[PDB]
Design a protein around this ligand. Structure first.
Ligand SMILES: *[C@@H]1O[C@H](CO[C@@H]2O[C@@H](C)[C@@H](O)[C@@H](O)[C@@H]2O)[C@@H](O)[C@H](O)[C@H]1NC(C)=O
Lengths: 49, 50
């Protein structure tokens, strides 16, 4: 679900939050985390979303 | 890019998609003939060291 407060369950990272689109670009890497270890921004392969 | 080590593990563009056991040797084959060298299966390969 997009841009709504929902129960996310992602690659062994689970919780509640609101997802948002971003237009960044990186030929490698799929997930990007915070200093504390939580993951904010990420991409998916087939579409680079 | 794909990189493999003597331990046999492989990184997909430096990611490490899949894990394997110890690989001793590998045999590779593709369109690399000499003419398609610019557009061959791979581009550059090297024996790299830590
Ligand atoms: C997102 O896209 C930006 C391009 O301009 C923006 O286009 C859309 C997405 C609207 O937000 C519009 O108001 C802007 O003009 C890029 O500059 C920006 O870097 C992109 N985001 C990322 C994370 O790369």
């Amino acid at each position: 679900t997009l841009d709504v407060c929902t129960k996310y369950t992602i690659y062994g990272f689970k919780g509640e939050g609101i997802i948002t689109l971003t237009n960044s670009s990186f030929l490698a890497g799929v997930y990007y985390t915070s200093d504390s270890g939580q993951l904010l921004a990420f991409k998916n392969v087939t579409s680079g979303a | 890019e794909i990189v493999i080590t003597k331990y046999g593990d492989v990184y997909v563009n430096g990611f490490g998609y899949l894990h394997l056991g110890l690989l001793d040797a590998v045999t590779i084959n593709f369109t690399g003939h000499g003419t398609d060298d610019d557009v061959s299966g791979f581009w550059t390969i090297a024996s790299t060291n830590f």
